[model samples]
Target: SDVIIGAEQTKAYFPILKNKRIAIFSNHTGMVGNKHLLDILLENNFNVVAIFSPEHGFRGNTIDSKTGVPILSLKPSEASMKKFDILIVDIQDVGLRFYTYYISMVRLMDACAEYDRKILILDRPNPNGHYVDGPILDMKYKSGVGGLPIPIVHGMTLGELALMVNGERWLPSSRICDVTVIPCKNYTHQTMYRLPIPPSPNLPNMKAIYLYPSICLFEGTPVSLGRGTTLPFQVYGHPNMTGYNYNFTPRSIPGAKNPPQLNKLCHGVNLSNLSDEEIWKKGINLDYLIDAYHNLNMGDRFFRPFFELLVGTDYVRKMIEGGKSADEIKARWKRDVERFKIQRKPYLLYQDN
Candidate 1:
């Protein structure tokens, strides 16, 4: 609670929100202690016109039962932009390229710019904010998962990234949003912030959130990231890898119904026991994936096309297939991290580590 998020600074942005038709882009992660962002605004008698619920489990009605406000899609369409004057973005993003929350934020910013609407971002600290690593995306591999050319672990808050988008003219036709970022007080790039709410369904805890950078690459492979189990992203395995004791079976669960290798036994390393300091030290460890690849012994058949998109490049898979070490692979991106740190310097809102 020492770090004050943008939404918590009510006096700063609350005045700006007055009388504007507001549509908040948030999910369950958006909150100020016990109260939801919508509740706080509604409690203050602000004109909250709509709700843009991100891809998560906030269901049961088109209109919010509490306030009768309409709930819109995750990323609002062109016409939907006309419905609101200003958009309030109160999202808790994990700060990874593959993580879809930032992608949705980019869409919202694009819409706001196209229609000349304003955006007020209530920025939260990135859970994996301590260090930056991984490759900078080549635009050729850019997709819905990753639209911008940044490292896998970009190490930026939504506000900082938003500023960069405006500065770099990253939007289509070089459009820019009239953006205002309420930065987190007492939060820096080095601050290892722990989120109270799960940022997404799969990343249920801090360990999973920390491991997401490394483990998410398994999404493209046959390996199971324990999606159907209690600790998704906390472990990874394939039915092929035997002689291991850590066992898990992907079941048809609420968050993950048809998880990879469902009902079959999976044996792999459990990263849940790793200390936060150790995880922080090993920024984006490719060792886990490489280990699985070695065990499977499937050679070129190990990776799927989705791996390219997840890592934002094809070189990673090629290197692993060509008998490259994880350290060697990480070395390739070492410069990208340094360059991004410099590139993002001008737009940064908080102090560096």
Candidate 2:
């Protein structure tokens, strides 16, 4: 099982769309088997007219936050908007506000509207959906990761997000083709990332995904979200981080290393190699995510412009600066998040409670 249960549902319309000219917006992670989606479509003999890649380009290793503009706007000199009739999307979003793939979807939505193309989204679960944390994105801080005005842990599948995006007129669904969402199966709002497949290489297991959304904010600053290392997002630290717990056993996890490049001024936590199954079994606590942000934060004094935008709202930055606990800040959003649940009811795919 791949996470795409609704892909089979698409078989219902296969005959009708069999020979239609199609374009797919996806990358290396958009695969159902050993074959990537582009290969699957072509092998099944559907005419794939074009591919619109996102920040990392068609290949997955473009560096997490780095964006590739040329590949995103790729257009053939000879071919015009008449190249395709329907545009299908199968992007495996990393579930962070600024990961670039989500932004790619936003731009692709714009192009589809401009060309009057039909858009079909193959929905996948959000690896970070189980826990909704992080500051809402403010429009002033817009970037490839936070293109539209949305929350940090938006807590929706890509298909439902497409509906919200389309419904909100972020891209003007009227301009592009008709939109259809191929939702996942047996997926519920409560399901943790552990149940879903790791959408990318860096996120080889659920612990990485579980720690991503909030941890990713590290990108806005100088700290590494463990990129360029084997642990990827799960392990992080700069050279400055050294404190022995009361037990004097050292707070770092066993097998964690201090690379020379980390420098003596940096400090970080080791969150590596724990599986989702292991995290819950071992009592991994994420409530400390906010604590880490507060404790390690060099403050708005340093990453003011960047942090303000990455969070999409001045509230998060201000809250931290104002000395509000993460719990207090999260409390203010409770009512609003509940309202969002009501708004999302119409688009929910799973029947589970």
The model with the greatest lDDT is 1
Q: What would the per-residue lDDT of candidate 2 be over residues 230-278, giving only the tens digit for each residue?
A: 5666765554334512111122322335432442334566666455665
Error of 1 at 244 (Å): 1.6
lDDT of 1 by residue, 187-211 (tens): 8888888999887778899999999
- Please give the TM-score that candidate 1 achieves against the real structure: 0.96
Candidate 1 Cα misplacement greater than 4 A, ranges? 56-61
What lDDT score is found at residue 250 in candidate 2?
21
The Cα local distance difference test for each model comes to 0.87, 0.60
> What TM-score does model 2 achieve against the real structure?
0.78
TM-score of each: 0.96, 0.78
**Worst 10-residue stretch by lDDT in candidate 1?**
53-62
Q: For every candidate structure, what is the RMSD over all alpha carbons to the true structure, in angstroms?
A: 1.5, 6.2
